Design goal:
By secondary structure, this protein is of the alpha+beta class. The protein has helices at residues 26-43, 51-57, 69-78, 119-128, 141-144; strands at residues 6-7, 82-83, 104-106, 110-113, 132-136, 150-151, 163-173, 176-182, 194-198, 212-215. Strands 1, 5, 6, 7, 8 and 9 form a 6-stranded mixed sheet that branches. Strands 2-3 form a two-stranded antiparallel ribbon. It has a two-stranded antiparallel sheet with strand order 4-10. Strand 7 (163-173) and strand 8 (176-182) form a beta hairpin. The structure holds ligand IHJ. It is classed as hydrolase.
Length: 216
């Protein structure tokens, strides 16, 4: 049975919150966060991986203009690795795809998608695999200015996916079930960079519509 609560921050599987800056590279940050968890699970080391490597190199995505996490996991697998943040730092604008003869920090062997709209399957994946990359509708002012509590807004549109984040756990606060979400808008956004989003409230904000995790 998947546990009632899981918080990967408490287990040391989650790196510090980053800021994507003036670039719409959320998909890159969501992707490396998931790879960071699997690297930790597999090797015992927690390390910042490189979202810039993905922005500059995943030709199938649109750089600072948006992209898909699956395309990023596919690139890491075909390219035989992703560099660390230290070897390929984030600059927040698209540039040429650079090759670092010794930058390789993690590999990926593929990915799996969570069945569309199934929060129970998402819960199980988080519990057994670790942090999972998810997409949501982040267009509401109530989301943008979130500060605390379990977020739920009836206006959220589960078919309007416009932002990529990372699910690092789930739980319940004052009787309300939630997902623990790591964002990439810096530590000053939300609650130290995180937001608790309603869980089992009918796929609120489309949280379970485009979820995936990398195989390592
Ligand atoms: C993040 N950050 C992020 N930024 C986005 C996204 N769509 C547009 N933007 C920017 C807003 C200012 C201009 C660019 C997304 N979208 C997103 C989130 C999660 C999963 C998928 C996804 O969209 C992937 C396709 C994006 N696509 C690019 C090409 N245009 C023509 C249509 C939209 N995230």
């Amino acid at each position: 049975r998947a546990p009632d609560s899981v918080d990967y921050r408490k287990k040391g599987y989650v790196t510090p919150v980053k800021n994507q800056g003036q670039c719409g590279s959320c998909w890159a940050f969501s992707s490396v966060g998931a790879l960071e968890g699997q690297l930790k699970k597999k090797t015992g080391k927690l390390l910042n991986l490189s979202p810039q490597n993905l922005v500059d190199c995943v030709s199938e995505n649109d750089g600072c203009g948006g992209g898909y996490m699956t395309n990023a996991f596919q690139y890491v697998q075909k390219n035989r690795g992703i560099d660390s943040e230290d070897a390929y730092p984030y600059v927040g604008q698209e540039e040429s795809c650079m090759y670092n003869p010794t930058g390789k920090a993690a590999k990926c062997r593929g990915y799996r998608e969570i069945p569309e709209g199934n929060e129970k399957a998402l819960k199980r994946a988080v519990a057994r695999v670790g942090p999972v990359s998810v997409a949501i509708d982040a267009s509401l002012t109530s989301f943008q200015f979130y500060s605390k509590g379990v977020y739920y807004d009836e206006s959220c549109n589960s078919d309007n996916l416009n932002h990529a984040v990372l699910a690092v756990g789930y739980g319940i606060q004052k009787g309300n079930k939630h997902w623990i979400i790591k964002n990439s808008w810096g530590e000053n956004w939300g609650n130290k960079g995180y937001i608790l989003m309603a869980r089992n409230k009918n796929n609120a904000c489309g949280i379970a519509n485009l979820a995936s995790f990398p195989k390592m």
